[PDB]
Design an enzyme around this catalytic site. Structure first.
Site, PDB file in Angstrom:
ATOM      1  N   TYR B 103       0.853  -1.189   0.000  1.00 25.79           N
ATOM      2  CA  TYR B 103       0.000   0.000   0.000  1.00 25.79           C
ATOM      3  C   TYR B 103       0.893   1.244   0.000  1.00 25.79           C
ATOM      4  CZ  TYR B 103      -4.088  -2.899   1.377  1.00 25.79           C
ATOM      5  OH  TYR B 103      -5.074  -3.849   1.441  1.00 25.79           O
ATOM      6  N   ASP B 165      -2.543 -10.869   9.781  1.00 26.60           N
ATOM      7  CA  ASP B 165      -1.581 -11.906   9.431  1.00 26.60           C
ATOM      8  C   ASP B 165      -0.180 -11.719  10.005  1.00 26.60           C
ATOM      9  OD1 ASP B 165      -3.537 -13.392   8.187  1.00 26.60           O
ATOM     10  OD2 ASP B 165      -3.114 -12.632   6.171  1.00 26.60           O
ATOM     11  N   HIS B 417       4.850  -7.114  -2.803  1.00 27.58           N
ATOM     12  CA  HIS B 417       3.411  -7.200  -2.726  1.00 27.58           C
ATOM     13  C   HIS B 417       2.606  -5.982  -3.136  1.00 27.58           C
ATOM     14  CE1 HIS B 417       3.648  -6.824   1.583  1.00 27.58           C
ATOM     15  NE2 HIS B 417       2.609  -7.568   1.915  1.00 27.58           N
ATOM     16  N   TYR B 498     -11.709  -1.045  -0.529  1.00 28.80           N
ATOM     17  CA  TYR B 498     -11.662  -0.406   0.774  1.00 28.80           C
ATOM     18  C   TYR B 498     -10.335   0.285   1.127  1.00 28.80           C
ATOM     19  CZ  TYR B 498      -8.871  -3.065   4.089  1.00 28.80           C
ATOM     20  OH  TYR B 498      -7.851  -3.536   4.878  1.00 28.80           O
ATOM     21  N   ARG B 499      -9.276  -0.039   0.390  1.00 22.10           N
ATOM     22  CA  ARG B 499      -7.940   0.522   0.598  1.00 22.10           C
ATOM     23  C   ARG B 499      -7.068   0.286  -0.621  1.00 22.10           C
ATOM     24  NH1 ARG B 499      -5.325  -2.370   5.973  1.00 22.10           N
ATOM     25  NH2 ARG B 499      -3.382  -1.396   5.308  1.00 22.10           N
TER      26      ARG B 499
HETATM   27  C1  LIG Z   1       2.937  -7.879   3.134  1.00 14.34           C
HETATM   28  C2  LIG Z   1       1.661  -8.121   3.903  1.00 14.34           C
HETATM   29  C3  LIG Z   1       0.894  -7.032   4.339  1.00 14.34           C
HETATM   30  C4  LIG Z   1      -0.299  -7.243   5.045  1.00 14.34           C
HETATM   31  C5  LIG Z   1      -0.711  -8.579   5.340  1.00 14.34           C
HETATM   32  C6  LIG Z   1       0.044  -9.669   4.893  1.00 14.34           C
HETATM   33  C7  LIG Z   1       1.229  -9.454   4.182  1.00 14.34           C
HETATM   34  C8  LIG Z   1       2.048 -10.635   3.719  1.00 14.34           C
HETATM   35  N1  LIG Z   1      -1.764  -8.847   6.136  1.00 14.34           N
HETATM   36  C9  LIG Z   1      -2.461  -7.807   6.630  1.00 14.34           C
HETATM   37  C10 LIG Z   1      -3.712  -8.071   7.286  1.00 14.34           C
HETATM   38  O1  LIG Z   1      -4.103  -9.206   7.547  1.00 14.34           O
HETATM   39  N2  LIG Z   1      -4.479  -6.963   7.621  1.00 14.34           N
HETATM   40  C11 LIG Z   1      -4.056  -5.671   7.329  1.00 14.34           C
HETATM   41  O2  LIG Z   1      -4.779  -4.729   7.649  1.00 14.34           O
HETATM   42  N3  LIG Z   1      -2.906  -5.437   6.719  1.00 14.34           N
HETATM   43  C12 LIG Z   1      -2.102  -6.455   6.352  1.00 14.34           C
HETATM   44  N4  LIG Z   1      -1.020  -6.200   5.555  1.00 14.34           N
HETATM   45  C13 LIG Z   1      -0.641  -4.806   5.234  1.00 14.34           C
HETATM   46  C14 LIG Z   1       0.195  -4.162   6.337  1.00 14.34           C
HETATM   47  O3  LIG Z   1       1.281  -5.019   6.674  1.00 14.34           O
HETATM   48  C15 LIG Z   1      -0.642  -3.878   7.582  1.00 14.34           C
HETATM   49  O4  LIG Z   1      -1.887  -3.308   7.187  1.00 14.34           O
HETATM   50  C16 LIG Z   1       0.083  -2.928   8.532  1.00 14.34           C
HETATM   51  O5  LIG Z   1      -0.637  -2.812   9.756  1.00 14.34           O
HETATM   52  C17 LIG Z   1       0.260  -1.549   7.908  1.00 14.34           C
HETATM   53  O6  LIG Z   1       1.431  -0.930   8.414  1.00 14.34           O
HETATM   54  P1  LIG Z   1       1.335  -0.155   9.818  1.00 14.34           P
HETATM   55  O7  LIG Z   1       0.195  -0.703  10.604  1.00 14.34           O
HETATM   56  O8  LIG Z   1       2.689  -0.115  10.435  1.00 14.34           O
HETATM   57  O9  LIG Z   1       0.960   1.335   9.289  1.00 14.34           O
HETATM   58  P2  LIG Z   1       1.925   2.609   9.007  1.00 14.34           P
HETATM   59  O10 LIG Z   1       3.175   2.113   8.365  1.00 14.34           O
HETATM   60  O11 LIG Z   1       2.021   3.414  10.257  1.00 14.34           O
HETATM   61  O12 LIG Z   1       1.057   3.404   7.906  1.00 14.34           O
HETATM   62  C18 LIG Z   1      -0.205   3.827   8.369  1.00 14.34           C
HETATM   63  C19 LIG Z   1      -0.876   4.800   7.415  1.00 14.34           C
HETATM   64  O13 LIG Z   1      -1.978   5.381   8.151  1.00 14.34           O
HETATM   65  C20 LIG Z   1      -1.730   6.742   8.416  1.00 14.34           C
HETATM   66  N5  LIG Z   1      -1.237   6.936   9.780  1.00 14.34           N
HETATM   67  C21 LIG Z   1      -0.427   6.111  10.510  1.00 14.34           C
HETATM   68  N6  LIG Z   1      -0.150   6.574  11.708  1.00 14.34           N
HETATM   69  C22 LIG Z   1      -0.819   7.786  11.761  1.00 14.34           C
HETATM   70  C23 LIG Z   1      -0.930   8.769  12.764  1.00 14.34           C
HETATM   71  N7  LIG Z   1      -0.334   8.668  13.957  1.00 14.34           N
HETATM   72  N8  LIG Z   1      -1.676   9.860  12.494  1.00 14.34           N
HETATM   73  C24 LIG Z   1      -2.268   9.953  11.298  1.00 14.34           C
HETATM   74  N9  LIG Z   1      -2.240   9.096  10.280  1.00 14.34           N
HETATM   75  C25 LIG Z   1      -1.492   8.024  10.580  1.00 14.34           C
HETATM   76  C26 LIG Z   1      -0.764   7.226   7.345  1.00 14.34           C
HETATM   77  O14 LIG Z   1      -1.486   7.790   6.265  1.00 14.34           O
HETATM   78  C27 LIG Z   1      -0.008   5.962   6.941  1.00 14.34           C
HETATM   79  O15 LIG Z   1       0.108   5.910   5.529  1.00 14.34           O
HETATM   80  C1  LIG Z   2      -3.271  -9.612   3.833  1.00 22.61           C
HETATM   81  C2  LIG Z   2      -4.182  -8.415   3.853  1.00 22.61           C
HETATM   82  C3  LIG Z   2      -3.791  -7.228   3.230  1.00 22.61           C
HETATM   83  C4  LIG Z   2      -4.628  -6.123   3.248  1.00 22.61           C
HETATM   84  C5  LIG Z   2      -5.853  -6.218   3.890  1.00 22.61           C
HETATM   85  O1  LIG Z   2      -6.640  -5.139   3.890  1.00 22.61           O
HETATM   86  C6  LIG Z   2      -6.243  -7.396   4.516  1.00 22.61           C
HETATM   87  N1  LIG Z   2      -7.554  -7.409   5.161  1.00 22.61           N
HETATM   88  O2  LIG Z   2      -8.023  -8.470   5.650  1.00 22.61           O
HETATM   89  O3  LIG Z   2      -8.237  -6.369   5.295  1.00 22.61           O
HETATM   90  C7  LIG Z   2      -5.410  -8.508   4.495  1.00 22.61           C
END
Ligand SMILES: *Cc1cc2c(cc1C)nc1c(=O)[nH]c(=O)nc-1n2C[C@H](O)[C@H](O)[C@H](O)COP(=O)(O)OP(=O)(O)OC[C@H]1O[C@@H](n2cnc3c(N)ncnc32)[C@H](O)[C@@H]1O
Ligand SMILES: Cc1ccc(O)c([N+](=O)[O-])c1
Ligand SMILES: *Cc1cc2c(cc1C)nc1c(=O)[nH]c(=O)nc-1n2C[C@H](O)[C@H](O)[C@H](O)COP(=O)(O)OP(=O)(O)OC[C@H]1O[C@@H](n2cnc3c(N)ncnc32)[C@H](O)[C@@H]1O
Ligand SMILES: *Cc1cc2c(cc1C)nc1c(=O)[nH]c(=O)nc-1n2C[C@H](O)[C@H](O)[C@H](O)COP(=O)(O)OP(=O)(O)OC[C@H]1O[C@@H](n2cnc3c(N)ncnc32)[C@H](O)[C@@H]1O
Ligand SMILES: Cc1ccc(O)c([N+](=O)[O-])c1
Ligand SMILES: Cc1ccc(O)c([N+](=O)[O-])c1
Lengths: 555, 555, 555
Positions: B103, B165, B417, B498-499
């Site tokens: 993403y 995950d 990914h 949704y994203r």
């Molecule tokens: C590679 C992958 C990714 C993945 C997954 C499985 C694999 C193999 N399974 C996931 C799952 O089951 N569900 C899910 O929601 N995501 C999954 N992913 C994708 C990813 O790994 C996760 O979603 C992960 O949680 C996202 O990274 P993180 O949670 O660390 O988020 P971030 O790097 O901080 O980016 C967040 C975005 O939201 C906004 N943001 C973040 N923090 C703030 C604050 N404090 N204030 C305002 N906005 C904020 C930003 O826009 C940022 O882009």
């Molecule tokens: C692995 C993965 C990646 C992005 C998502 O949004 C997700 N989900 O269940 O919502 C799961």
């Protein structure tokens, strides 16, 4: 029409007339209605509600009251009326049903405002879908209406409606207000998906997936936007993409809602209401603690409710039918009435839903858990007299609307309801402290305490029922004093209120002052950005447009 | 530092320097980091993520990338940095973990932007409360961190974490994004209560009951606002009073979040993961239909998921470890691999939670229901090889984080990914159509289809996994083409997403155009009202401040 | 200088430097002083006061503190500094002496502000006039200075100075603040006439008759305005013509005062201080009632004062010199100390002025009136030990300054004063209620109650003396809690406060909220109209310029 009994701030009768003249040309005279005289100021009945002011007035009867009333025939009219309102800067105050009594009814915060009766003409059940297990609706559909529609269509076996106590309210009106209901689908606001609303600028806007357009088929060509169908996912998933704005529409003046998606619980295939009477007053404490884990653990499925003794009796009888005494009844007298009615000093109504094996198992756990309480006694609806409150909630707990509960408003002569509603933890200690504080103040005012907790997952809405004779001016003042004081005391103890009457939205918003009223300040910003002219329901929840000086308006 | 490899729009190096000079004085040099050269552009690993740009870049690697990085030490710094950003009109792009790969990762939409690493210093688990069954957290806490905290404190027996995950992401970062998780507490955004965020104007603001102030005790005197405790109900009931603004903070640039309340499921007292392999490809259809009612009926408790064959194999092996073929594997080959691994052409993972009597009963219903499918076969984790995907999800389905799943990113050589994620009805017919459309386009691009549905109550998130070698420029273009085309086709069939990744937020927002992009227009209004200077993450979800011309910026 | 330990809001170090660079060029380096490090943060002594922050800090020591200090050489510099402040929007915070301890001392409300030391260079007694019985003065003249000037000039026989307890404060600084004093001329603000002040725009302005220009004589030609003489009536009659603006200058940020007219009491030709010890604690009530009529009737001439037992003892001794006990002393112990010192549980100090026949007559009335009190005992200064508080006030009551009273600050180890000052009726019942409420809260905080009423015509300033060890952080918090609670309780009982410390000006202004804070709103209007940039002492008395958001600044 010519001369309203009162008028909006900063406006000439000359302007009111040109404004109303134009509305009549749009909606036709059948739809408009100016308030010219006192004979028009009648406090209705719940069955036929008054749209001109507060029926349950704590304040002067003619205090909050409209200059006129206007029923838009449909969305286009709303867009149009809104446009005129901007020209004149005339304040609007929308309503679906007018059933919000105990919170000010149909009355507008700012007087002389035109009241949009969204409900009269926009009455339609737009859709019911069995696979999606949801329906769609206009402001006019009351709970009873929906139930009948389901029943006419024989769909009642397929899906159940969730419903608050009395059944007459607007399904969406109650939803936007975040009103509570009894089944597992009890949190109304939580159960919606996709909405439509008219912005202050009159532009239309669907939300969530409501924004993704249904692809164009030859059959849908030429349709006006308000008439256009929703895409398939609109009512199935609330989030959409980007910022989730739906909340801006709950308890606020951000815009007028025209239709709304609402979930429906599939028939569970099993049901049995139940009761558990707690003997002592003090049992309230242990009961709550016994409940906390059952709720989180999903033992208790729907929104159960702990009812005070007088509430059930108010339904069964007038204070006069129990005591010639003109003051708060004693604990002794309270113990006596329970013995007469077979109820505890507190009484837990709730329910089970599912196949028998699930139901049987849950019933054991629940019964076994509550037994720690000395003297508890469990009754099924069958096990009770044919007038019992239980026989009634048994229907409420399964989506069947009723009106039997209004009887409690009748405790005093000229009944009038007023809800104090602080939130409280699912804790015996917290719940006990809140009850005591609320009771003492009630006693100070000469009123009988009456209330019911409605159990949420991690919280309970404590609903204090202030019944008061609507003609004793002294009692009213004591009541205003009661409310205001209760607001401050609970505030001074971490307790908030989830909703309230027009006469106190300002005070309650002020309790929400962390960091220098930062919360309110953020809202006004959003408000003024969205409605430069302050046309839409100014003062709702205490949010004032820049035009209204806080000095003149707050209260 | 001196010269960033790229800079924000409309700004001199002279200004960048004065700006960065000032930030270094605030957060100290240890915290700041300017991007001066290519050796800095390293694509990390999931275990040690890169904060400078997109690791999984579909576009040029150096396309989206920051001018610098800045870790605020605490809330006051954020308020301060924000203040400076306004002086210079420098764009900020907040992030907790940087783990959002698939993403766009840590990369900002607009290049040269300063990236706020909220996570480095604000790492604290602020609270865990057993009675309320919730906790509070800063941006720095990953799922693993929380799990350990629970486990160190021996609280793991008292409360379970819900987890997506891979376990490394920010608990709140994922929450604001509305990410999905596996237990009954799977809808992350739904499970929050009370938040805190820094507005574009740097003012603090709690929400919901977060606004009702905790009464003043001698012990809490003098505390700075960010350090002040929350009132008792703050984390227990999300609504508060007045407009419910929390959503404005999901998937949007309205403000920076500093802490957030999140629910926690009490230990259910029972658990057993399970599996049901569907033999044929076409079985996807009946399976979905069999599922619809089980979901609404609460038979299926948590968020179950139908996994495609290749997804489970990707976890078990490289495409190379199954075929020397350089193109999409045939249905024949797909049938073969399933026979090798003992899996169906589709495989339903899910779980049961509760005492045995509930579990036994549910298990019957589920097993009995799925039997209508010819050839179905039910396995418990025990019943399978010690490497099986099931043995892994068994932990995921009980709050235990893991990292075993990253293995699937390795299907191709340089794994990368990219998630396509349209929503779809809980219907066999709809689900079948979506799969076919997504598959054909994948085949057109030369890629193997791979995905997994994640079952919500009334919907399913169809998650298409686009793996692609991050070094083949041609493949990348084919992929960009893949995404863009998929977006339009599903759109043309009622399907939303949704994203998504930075490179397509604009296109996806455009699909949400009912009534002339009314939805986006309403948001920009809110945006500009709230952040006049467009300092905060401009372009997130496609919402652009007035300063950014849509002609130059959209994409 | 280079880098201040803190800086004004919204400003670069680059700007601070250009600003300070320019000031140094104006006033010369001898006059400027930047606060670069902690060794600069020394809490002085009353004899040599610290200009950088609050000496008596209830809050963190380095909480309120200046970025620098600047001593204008004369009026022209002030006009100039002001001009620069506008260019940079740098906040100023004026002070004459810095002696305002127990109310925040020299510290500015908003940190990083430049502190104008008006007193260093503008030290001059501009005039003393025997016929008019008044004098004129710059900010630098302390009471002692004036007394000496009168005494050097042998004028002491011709005119008497009125003086507050300790003698070191600025004659005008105390006047603008409306501080109290002991002789018949005790109401300081009342005794002024004609003033001069620099407006936010740097323009000069005299007031009252100060505006009527002294006719031009050859000798006065060419004089700069600030140096020009006043017309004859300027100091004799305060009203002038048209609106009477002097009050805008009391306790407010409307402008900087440069000189001011002050009356002087002609030597009365007779004097005899006196004392009357009230035996019991409860005697406070009758004594007040006996006093009411004597005050209105002019029996009691000057501002007499009822002192609590501990106050007089604090002057005589340390708490340690009376009890090893670490908690509030008991009523028993209080009765004991009075027996040791020969004082009552309350002690009325006062005086008589005039020829003997008047004095004799008044003395009879007073003595005869107080006799209704059982056990009262009247002492003349002669009649007491050579260390008695009376021997001291005998001088205070005749314009002789002293410093003996500081001894009371020493009750606890690290002495630090903090004045709570609610106003109270000249009524035994009201006075009694106020004392009780203030005492209980003090006990709750673990502090000894200590205070003194200072009797005005129709009112009494109740001055609660909060002594507290300035190094016990816990005690400090208890104290902050003490103040805040006292403010609310007295508010809830009709009691206001005439003055307070920086850390509570906001809270106290909020008590003054009749009609929706109408009072504050009117002031901000005046404020912003007068100082568009908010340069002058923003936040004084709670009045904030539009630039300072009330969310970030209030407290
Ligand atoms: C590679 C992958 C990714 C993945 C997954 C499985 C694999 C193999 N399974 C996931 C799952 O089951 N569900 C899910 O929601 N995501 C999954 N992913 C994708 C990813 O790994 C996760 O979603 C992960 O949680 C996202 O990274 P993180 O949670 O660390 O988020 P971030 O790097 O901080 O980016 C967040 C975005 O939201 C906004 N943001 C973040 N923090 C703030 C604050 N404090 N204030 C305002 N906005 C904020 C930003 O826009 C940022 O882009
Ligand atoms: C692995 C993965 C990646 C992005 C998502 O949004 C997700 N989900 O269940 O919502 C799961
Ligand atoms: C007397 C009484 C009331 C009561 C109750 C029991 C008794 C004896 N039990 C209730 C319960 O269990 N749960 C509950 O939420 N409420 C209960 N009440 C109170 C009341 O009867 C109901 O809440 C009822 O649903 C409220 O009236 P109604 O639903 O008809 O609402 P309304 O009259 O339209 O007023 C709605 C308010 O919301 C805003 N509003 C309404 N429509 C719109 C539209 N279209 N657009 C924008 N805003 C809208 C208005 O601000 C209006 O004030
Ligand atoms: C410790 C103590 C204090 C005390 C007292 C007894 C003791 C033991 N007895 C006092 C008494 O009997 N009456 C009284 O009014 N105060 C008494 N105090 C408190 C304090 O010592 C005196 O009030 C003292 O006079 C105050 O200090 P000073 O008079 O030196 O004032 P300052 O330090 O200059 O601060 C004045 C405030 O007013 C505004 N100000 C001052 N000068 C200007 C100019 N030129 N222009 C505009 N505003 C000005 C500022 O806001 C400043 O904060
Ligand atoms: C009877 C009643 C009245 C107002 C409410 O809000 C309510 N509730 O459960 O939420 C119930
Ligand atoms: C000692 C003292 C301190 C502050 C005051 O205000 C005061 N007074 O008489 O007005 C006396």
């Amino acid at each position: 029409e010519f001369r309203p009994l009162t008028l909006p701030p900063k406006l000439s009768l000359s302007d009111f007339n040109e404004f109303i003249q134009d509305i009549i040309r749009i909606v036709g005279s059948e739809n408009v209605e100016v308030i010219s005289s006192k004979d028009q100021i009648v406090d209705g009945s719940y069955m036929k509600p008054t749209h001109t002011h507060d029926p349950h007035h704590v304040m002067d009867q003619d205090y909050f009251l409209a200059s006129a009333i206007v029923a838009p025939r449909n969305v286009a009219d709303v867009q149009s009326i809104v446009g005129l309102a901007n020209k004149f800067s005339f304040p609007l105050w929308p309503i679906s049903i007018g059933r919000n009594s105990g919170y000010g009814g149909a009355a507008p915060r700012v007087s002389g405002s035109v009241v949009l009766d969204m409900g009269k003409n926009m009455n339609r059940v737009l859709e019911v879908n069995v696979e999606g297990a949801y329906c769609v609706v206009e402001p006019g559909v009351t709970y009873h209406d929906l139930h009948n529609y389901l029943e006419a269509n024989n769909l009642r076996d397929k899906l159940w409606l969730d419903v608050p106590d009395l059944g007459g309210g607007s399904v969406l009106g109650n939803a936007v207000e975040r009103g509570v209901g009894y089944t597992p689908y009890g949190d109304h606001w939580m159960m919606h998906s996709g909405m439509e609303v008219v912005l202050a600028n009159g532009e239309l806007l669907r939300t969530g997936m409501g924004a993704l357009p249904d692809p164009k088929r030859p059959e849908t060509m030429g349709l006006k936007p308000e008439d256009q169908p929703w895409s398939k996912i609109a009512h199935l998933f609330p989030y959409g993409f980007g910022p989730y704005i739906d909340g801006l529409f709950s308890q606020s003046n951000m815009g007028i809602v025209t239709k709304i998606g609402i979930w429906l619980m599939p028939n569970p295939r099993g049901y049995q209401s139940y009761l558990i009477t707690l003997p002592k007053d003090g049992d309230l404490k242990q009961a709550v603690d016994i409940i906390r884990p059952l709720r989180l653990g999903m033992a208790l499925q729907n929104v159960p409710t702990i009812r005070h003794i007088l509430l059930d009796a108010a339904v069964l009888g007038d204070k006069r039918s129990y005591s010639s005494r003109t003051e708060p009844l004693s604990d002794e007298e309270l113990d006596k009435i329970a013995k007469q009615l077979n109820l505890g000093r507190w009484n837990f109504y709730g329910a089970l839903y599912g196949p028998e094996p699930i139901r049987r198992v849950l019933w054991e756990t629940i019964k076994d858990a509550f037994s720690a309480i000395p003297g508890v006694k469990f009754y099924f609806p069958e096990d009770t007299p044919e007038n019992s409150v239980l026989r009634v909630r048994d229907k409420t707990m399964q989506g069947i609307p009723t009106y039997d509960e209004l009887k409690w408003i009748d405790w005093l002569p000229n009944g009038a309801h007023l809800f104090f509603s602080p939130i409280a933890k699912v804790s015996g200690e917290d719940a006990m402290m809140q009850y005591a504080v609320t009771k003492k103040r009630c006693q100070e005012a000469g009123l009988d305490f009456i209330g019911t907790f409605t159990v949420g997952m991690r919280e309970m809405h404590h609903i204090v029922c202030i019944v008061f004779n609507k003609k004793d001016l002294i009692q009213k003042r004591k009541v205003q004093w009661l409310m205001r004081t209760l607001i401050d005391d609970c505030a001074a103890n971490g307790w908030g209120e989830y909703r309230t009457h027009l006469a106190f939205m300002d005070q309650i918003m002020e309790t929400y002052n962390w960091n220098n009223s930062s919360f309110l300040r953020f809202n006004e910003v959003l408000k003024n950005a969205v409605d430069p002219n302050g046309i839409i329901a100014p003062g709702k929840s205490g949010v004032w447009p820049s035009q209204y000086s806080h000095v003149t308006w707050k209260l």
